[PDB]
């Protein structure tokens, strides 16, 4: 199978550069397009550029020529992106995308996510939103997770180690005045499951490596 | 450059409808246009490719058609998954370009939301914080309201919402509001409430607690 396989989120000072990459595997790595195409939060996409590995030959979105550069090497079938005197407007998802030459998109990477900022890492808080008589309706109750002042995003929620996703509800995170993100993460589950079935929200925050399994235990 | 625009950010359909997303480019670029799907947190796919023929796995229900300046997307029956922003792309002329994206939500009827409140945690306290959070789940339409009353004063300036994509099977939001306050004022006060309106609530729903109950 056709795959591309994209490097990990990136935090980066202003100023400072940055290069990511993109692993193909399953196709001719050099009978294709490799272009990358940039989505800033909350908008539309951006073809950002492009290079043909079997010739060399690059192609760029003329107001990202300056500060970028698209490289190859053949012997990996690997493609980067070089992201150089980083500023604000350069945070954003960067896909990798397979085409013919001038062609559509057939292939995407998963995204990298790129931030810029200045500020330190910071982990989150994680408290516990406990089931009750005032969160039961019929036969529901409904349980979560608060997930406090962090920076930068994103904080990966699952439940029960990712066995519990029908009726979670993981909310957008929310930018604080403080410059710090907040979140929270609700299920509603059996109210006759509270006493036997135990609820662990898992939260993860890779930039500062806090790893939480809260257990939400149930108010009588 | 060639400049492609989609002159619809938002349309608005039900499951079942037929709805169309128009396309045009700034020169023609006979059939050299493909198709994106894009999801929440996801990669886009590519749904048409060639003005006109549906890609390699993609349902029936998707279609595309136009040559030269006028391109068209259509969906012939809408389903709940669809929910999506779709986006143009020309490969006539380097660079390729995108058109501004059309996002697709599935109209349905009104549903009220069903409200819950969290009273701050023990671990929360010890800390010297106290927050609270108001529930709002599986409503319709989007515009649910909430205030915040702490022994019956109406609370501004310390209160944050936010709002799920709308569900790929129901169609319906979800809502949080959390009120921070400073655990002296939070060990000032009684009763904390949390207050509803919305097209589906005839009358603001309340749901409140007691400090330390």
């Known amino acids: 199978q056709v795959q591309l396989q994209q490097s990990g989120a990136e935090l980066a000072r202003p100023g400072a550069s940055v290069k990511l990459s993109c692993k193909a595997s399953?196709?001719?790595?050099?009978?294709?397009?490799m272009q990358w195409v940039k989505q800033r939060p909350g908008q539309g996409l951006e073809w950002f550029g492009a290079?043909?590995?079997?010739?060399?030959?690059?192609r760029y979105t003329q107001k990202f020529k300056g500060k970028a550069t698209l490289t190859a090497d053949k012997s990996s079938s690997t493609a980067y992106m070089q992201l150089s005197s980083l500023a604000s407007e350069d945070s954003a998802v960067y896909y990798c995308?397979?085409?013919?030459?001038?062609?559509?998109?057939?292939?995407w990477g998963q995204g990298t996510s790129v931030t810029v900022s200045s500020a330190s890492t910071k982990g989150p808080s994680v408290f516990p939103l406990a089931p009750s008589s005032k969160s039961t309706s019929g036969g529901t109750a409904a349980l979560g997770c608060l997930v406090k002042d962090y920076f930068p995003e994103p904080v990966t929620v699952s439940w029960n180690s990712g066995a519990l996703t029908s009726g979670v509800h993981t909310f957008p995170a929310v930018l604080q005045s403080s410059g710090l993100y907040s979140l929270s993460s609700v299920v509603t589950v059996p109210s006759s499951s509270l006493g036997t079935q135990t609820y662990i929200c898992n939260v993860n925050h890779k930039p500062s490596n806090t790893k939480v399994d809260k257990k939400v235990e149930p108010k009588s | 450059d060639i400049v492609m625009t989609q002159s619809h950010k938002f349309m608005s359909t039900s499951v079942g409808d037929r709805v169309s997303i128009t396309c045009k480019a700034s020169?023609?670029?006979?059939?050299?246009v493909a198709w994106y799907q894009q999801k929440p947190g996801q990669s886009p796919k590519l749904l048409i490719y060639?003005?006109?023929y549906r890609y390699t796995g993609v349902p029936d229900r998707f279609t595309g058609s136009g040559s030269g300046t006028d391109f068209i997307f259509t969906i012939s029956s809408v389903q709940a998954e669809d929910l999506a922003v779709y986006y143009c792309?020309?490969?006539?002329?380097?660079?390729?370009?995108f058109g501004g994206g059309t996002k697709l939500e599935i109209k349905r009827t009104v549903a009220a939301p069903s409200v819950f409140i969290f009273p701050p945690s023990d671990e929360q306290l010890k800390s010297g914080t106290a927050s609270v959070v108001c529930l709002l789940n599986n409503f319709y339409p989007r515009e649910a309201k909430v205030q915040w009353k702490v022994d019956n004063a109406l609370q501004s300036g310390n209160s944050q919402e936010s709002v799920t994509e709308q569900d790929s099977k129901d169609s319906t939001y979800s809502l949080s509001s959390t009120l921070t306050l400073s655990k002296a004022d939070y060990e000032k006060h009684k009763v904390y409430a949390c207050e509803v309106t919305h097209q589906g609530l005839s009358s603001p729903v309340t749901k409140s607690f007691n400090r330390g109950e």
């Open positions: 995308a397979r085409s013919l030459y001038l062609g559509a998109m057939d292939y």
């Open positions: 399953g196709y001719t790595f050099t009978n294709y397009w």
């Open positions: 290079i043909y590995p079997g010739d060399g030959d690059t």
């Open positions: 020169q023609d670029v006979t059939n050299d």
């Open positions: 060639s003005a006109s």
């Open positions: 792309q020309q490969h006539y002329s380097a660079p390729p370009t």
